[PDB]
Amino acid sequence: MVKIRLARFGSKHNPHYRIVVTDARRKRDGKYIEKIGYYDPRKTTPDWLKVDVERARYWLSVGAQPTDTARRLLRQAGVFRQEAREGA
């Protein structure tokens, strides 16, 4: 059972979730096997998604199921496929 999703930590200080790899759902405190991505729902500038597609790819490589949100962030972090700046 490996799934990557957003980990809500901030309670009343800074709203930020990480794209971490844990079970289907927390049980008592919430723990993951490792942290591959990071997410920050900030409505200021387009620069809050920070993932290590390499580690985030380790999980997607072990049949890791990313929720619809973390799934759309693994594609944003350039995880499903490499990205480049063609035309130059």
Coordinates of N, CA and C in Angstrom, one line a residue:
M1 N 0.9 -1.2 0.0 CA 0.0 0.0 0.0 C 0.9 1.3 0.0
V2 N 1.1 1.8 -1.2 CA 2.0 3.1 -1.2 C 1.2 4.2 -2.0
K3 N 1.0 5.3 -1.3 CA 0.2 6.4 -2.0 C 0.8 7.7 -1.6
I4 N 1.1 8.6 -2.6 CA 1.7 9.9 -2.3 C 0.5 10.9 -2.3
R5 N 0.5 11.8 -1.3 CA -0.6 12.8 -1.3 C -0.2 14.0 -0.5
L6 N -1.1 14.9 -0.3 CA -0.7 16.2 0.5 C -0.8 16.0 2.0
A7 N 0.3 16.3 2.7 CA 0.3 16.1 4.2 C 0.0 17.4 4.9
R8 N -1.2 17.6 5.4 CA -1.5 18.9 6.1 C -0.8 19.0 7.4
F9 N 0.1 19.9 7.6 CA 0.8 20.1 8.9 C 0.3 21.3 9.6
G10 N 0.6 22.5 9.0 CA 0.2 23.8 9.6 C -1.2 23.7 10.2
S11 N -1.4 24.2 11.4 CA -2.8 24.2 12.0 C -3.4 25.6 11.9
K12 N -2.7 26.5 12.5 CA -3.2 28.0 12.4 C -2.0 28.9 12.3
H13 N -1.0 28.5 11.5 CA 0.2 29.4 11.3 C 0.5 29.5 9.8
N14 N 0.8 28.4 9.2 CA 1.2 28.5 7.7 C 0.5 27.2 7.0
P15 N -0.4 27.5 6.1 CA -1.1 26.4 5.4 C -0.2 25.8 4.3
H16 N 0.4 24.7 4.6 CA 1.3 24.0 3.6 C 1.2 22.5 3.8
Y17 N 1.1 21.8 2.7 CA 1.1 20.3 2.7 C 2.3 19.8 2.0
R18 N 2.8 18.6 2.3 CA 3.9 18.1 1.5 C 3.4 16.9 0.7
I19 N 4.0 16.6 -0.4 CA 3.6 15.5 -1.2 C 4.4 14.3 -0.7
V20 N 4.0 13.7 0.4 CA 4.8 12.7 1.0 C 4.2 11.3 0.7
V21 N 5.0 10.3 1.0 CA 4.6 8.9 0.6 C 4.2 8.1 1.9
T22 N 2.9 7.8 2.1 CA 2.5 7.1 3.3 C 1.4 6.1 3.0
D23 N 0.8 5.5 4.0 CA -0.3 4.5 3.7 C -1.5 5.2 3.1
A24 N -2.6 4.5 3.1 CA -3.9 5.1 2.5 C -4.4 6.2 3.4
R25 N -4.2 6.2 4.7 CA -4.7 7.3 5.5 C -4.1 7.2 6.9
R26 N -3.8 8.3 7.5 CA -3.1 8.3 8.8 C -4.0 7.4 9.8
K27 N -3.4 7.2 11.0 CA -4.2 6.3 11.9 C -4.2 7.0 13.3
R28 N -3.1 7.4 13.8 CA -3.1 8.1 15.2 C -2.4 9.5 15.0
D29 N -1.3 9.5 14.4 CA -0.6 10.8 14.2 C -0.3 11.1 12.7
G30 N -0.2 10.1 11.9 CA 0.0 10.3 10.5 C 1.6 10.3 10.2
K31 N 2.0 9.2 9.5 CA 3.5 9.1 9.2 C 3.7 8.6 7.8
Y32 N 4.7 9.0 7.2 CA 5.0 8.5 5.8 C 6.4 7.8 5.7
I33 N 6.6 7.1 4.7 CA 7.9 6.3 4.5 C 9.0 7.3 4.1
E34 N 8.6 8.4 3.5 CA 9.7 9.4 3.1 C 9.0 10.6 2.5
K35 N 9.7 11.7 2.4 CA 9.1 12.9 1.8 C 9.7 13.2 0.4
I36 N 8.9 13.1 -0.6 CA 9.4 13.4 -2.0 C 9.0 14.7 -2.5
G37 N 7.8 15.1 -2.2 CA 7.3 16.4 -2.7 C 7.0 17.4 -1.6
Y38 N 6.7 18.6 -2.0 CA 6.3 19.7 -1.0 C 5.2 20.5 -1.7
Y39 N 4.2 20.9 -1.0 CA 3.2 21.7 -1.6 C 2.8 22.9 -0.7
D40 N 2.5 24.1 -1.3 CA 2.1 25.3 -0.5 C 1.0 26.0 -1.3
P41 N -0.2 25.9 -0.8 CA -1.3 26.6 -1.4 C -1.3 28.1 -1.2
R42 N -0.3 28.7 -1.8 CA -0.2 30.2 -1.7 C -0.8 30.9 -2.9
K43 N -1.7 31.9 -2.6 CA -2.3 32.6 -3.7 C -1.6 33.9 -4.0
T44 N -0.3 33.9 -4.0 CA 0.5 35.1 -4.3 C 1.3 35.0 -5.6
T45 N 2.2 34.1 -5.7 CA 3.0 33.9 -6.9 C 3.0 32.5 -7.3
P46 N 3.1 32.2 -8.6 CA 3.2 30.9 -9.1 C 4.5 30.2 -8.8
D47 N 4.7 29.8 -7.6 CA 6.0 29.1 -7.2 C 5.9 28.5 -5.9
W48 N 5.0 27.6 -5.7 CA 4.8 26.9 -4.4 C 5.0 25.4 -4.5
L49 N 5.0 24.9 -5.7 CA 5.2 23.4 -5.9 C 6.7 23.1 -5.9
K50 N 7.2 22.3 -4.9 CA 8.6 22.0 -4.9 C 8.8 20.4 -4.7
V51 N 9.0 19.7 -5.8 CA 9.1 18.2 -5.6 C 10.5 17.7 -6.1
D52 N 10.9 16.6 -5.5 CA 12.1 16.0 -6.0 C 11.7 14.8 -6.9
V53 N 11.2 15.2 -8.1 CA 10.7 14.1 -9.0 C 11.5 12.8 -9.0
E54 N 12.8 12.9 -8.7 CA 13.6 11.7 -8.6 C 13.0 10.8 -7.5
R55 N 12.9 11.3 -6.3 CA 12.3 10.6 -5.2 C 10.8 10.4 -5.4
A56 N 10.2 11.4 -5.9 CA 8.7 11.3 -6.2 C 8.6 10.3 -7.4
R57 N 9.6 10.0 -8.1 CA 9.6 9.0 -9.2 C 9.8 7.6 -8.6
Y58 N 10.5 7.5 -7.5 CA 10.8 6.2 -6.8 C 9.5 5.6 -6.4
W59 N 8.7 6.4 -5.9 CA 7.3 5.9 -5.4 C 6.5 5.6 -6.6
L60 N 6.3 6.5 -7.5 CA 5.5 6.2 -8.7 C 6.0 5.0 -9.4
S61 N 7.3 4.7 -9.1 CA 7.9 3.4 -9.7 C 7.5 2.2 -8.9
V62 N 7.2 2.4 -7.6 CA 6.8 1.2 -6.8 C 5.3 1.0 -6.8
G63 N 4.6 1.4 -7.8 CA 3.2 1.3 -7.8 C 2.6 2.3 -6.8
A64 N 3.2 3.4 -6.6 CA 2.7 4.4 -5.6 C 1.5 5.1 -6.3
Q65 N 0.4 5.2 -5.6 CA -0.8 5.8 -6.2 C -0.9 7.3 -5.6
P66 N -0.7 8.2 -6.4 CA -0.8 9.7 -6.0 C -2.3 10.1 -6.1
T67 N -2.8 10.7 -5.0 CA -4.2 11.2 -5.1 C -4.4 12.2 -6.3
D68 N -5.6 12.5 -6.6 CA -5.8 13.4 -7.8 C -5.0 14.7 -7.6
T69 N -4.9 15.2 -6.4 CA -4.2 16.5 -6.1 C -2.7 16.3 -6.3
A70 N -2.1 15.4 -5.5 CA -0.6 15.1 -5.6 C -0.3 14.5 -7.0
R71 N -1.3 14.0 -7.7 CA -1.1 13.5 -9.0 C -0.9 14.6 -9.9
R72 N -1.7 15.7 -9.8 CA -1.6 16.8 -10.6 C -0.3 17.7 -10.2
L73 N 0.3 17.3 -9.1 CA 1.5 18.1 -8.7 C 2.7 17.2 -9.1
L74 N 2.6 16.0 -9.3 CA 3.7 15.1 -9.7 C 3.9 15.5 -11.2
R75 N 2.9 15.8 -11.9 CA 3.0 16.2 -13.3 C 3.5 17.6 -13.4
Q76 N 3.2 18.4 -12.3 CA 3.7 19.8 -12.3 C 5.1 19.8 -11.9
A77 N 5.5 19.0 -11.1 CA 7.0 18.9 -10.7 C 7.8 18.2 -11.8
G78 N 7.1 17.8 -12.9 CA 7.9 17.1 -14.0 C 8.3 15.7 -13.5
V79 N 7.3 15.0 -13.1 CA 7.6 13.6 -12.6 C 7.2 12.6 -13.6
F80 N 6.0 12.6 -14.2 CA 5.6 11.6 -15.2 C 6.6 11.6 -16.4
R81 N 7.1 12.7 -16.7 CA 8.1 12.8 -17.9 C 9.0 13.9 -17.7
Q82 N 10.2 13.8 -18.3 CA 11.2 14.9 -18.2 C 10.7 16.2 -18.9
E83 N 11.3 17.3 -18.6 CA 10.9 18.6 -19.3 C 12.1 19.4 -19.7
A84 N 12.0 20.1 -20.7 CA 13.2 20.9 -21.2 C 12.8 22.2 -21.8
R85 N 13.7 23.0 -22.3 CA 13.4 24.4 -22.9 C 13.7 24.3 -24.4
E86 N 13.1 23.4 -25.1 CA 13.3 23.4 -26.6 C 13.2 24.8 -27.2
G87 N 13.6 24.9 -28.5 CA 13.5 26.2 -29.1 C 14.5 27.2 -28.5
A88 N 15.7 27.2 -28.9 CA 16.7 28.1 -28.3 C 18.0 28.1 -29.2

